[PDB]
DNA sequence: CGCCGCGTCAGACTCGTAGGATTATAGCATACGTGAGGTGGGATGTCAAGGCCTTTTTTGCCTAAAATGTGATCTAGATCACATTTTA
């Protein structure tokens, strides 16, 4: 959490300075820690996106309908 | 008794189209456990030569014994130009 705070606060100032966003190269430099941890945390920062959202813009497809289950078996494999 | 206000509750059906989110939240110190790493060590699994038995491959061998050789003495087939001679 603390690492994320420092990141997203510094990215604003880097946005002022550059006029653009920072890269994990430039930001791993500014963040004092190597690119592995940066990239890692960037991979961690994502949330879930709520199956009951309407990916059909019309009330046709709540996202859960789209989802496949690849867990059970296929009858051809059984045979 | 008979309004009136407020609130509850349905609004056809099968296909297709697209990807998709966002704000800001302090900071460092203590101390404890769990994940990724070492590490000898039973124990399991493998691979190359040897002793029990039967079968198989050579291989003795065992005697019936029928077969393989000895060669001078024959024999019953086999020929060819001429002289007819028969048959369709």
Residue whose tokens read 């059909």: A56
* Nearest nucleotide (C1') to alpha carbon of A8: B24
- Cα separations in angstroms, A13 against A6, A16, A17, A59: 11, 5, 6, 42
Find all residues with CB under 8 Å of A46, minimum gap 6, and list them.
none
**Length of chain A as a residue count:** 79
Return the residue matching tokens 């059970």: A72
Q: In angstroms, what is the resolution?
A: 3.9
CA–CA separation, A7 vs A45, rounded Å? Answer: 11
Structural biology method used:
cryo-EM
Name the DSSP letter for residue A63: G
Q: Which of residues 9-68 of A touch strand B (CB under 7 A)?
A: 9, 47, 49-50, 53-58, 60-61
- Residue carrying the six token digits 């059984």: A78
Cα angle vertex A40, ends A38, A44, to 5°?
Answer: 115
Kindly give the residue spans of alpha helices, DSSP state H, lying in chain A: 2-18, 24-30, 35-44, 75-78
Cα–Cα dist A46/A4, whole Å: 12
């Amino acid at each position: 959490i603390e690492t994320i705070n420092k990141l997203n606060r510094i990215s604003r100032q880097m946005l002022q300075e550059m006029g653009r966003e920072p890269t994990p190269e430039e930001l791993a430099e500014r963040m004092l820690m190597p690119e592995d941890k940066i990239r890692k945390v960037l991979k961690i920062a994502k949330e879930p996106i709520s199956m009951e959202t309407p990916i059909g813009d019309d009330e046709d497809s709540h996202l859960g309908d789209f989802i496949e289950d690849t867990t059970l078996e296929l009858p051809l494999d059984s045979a």
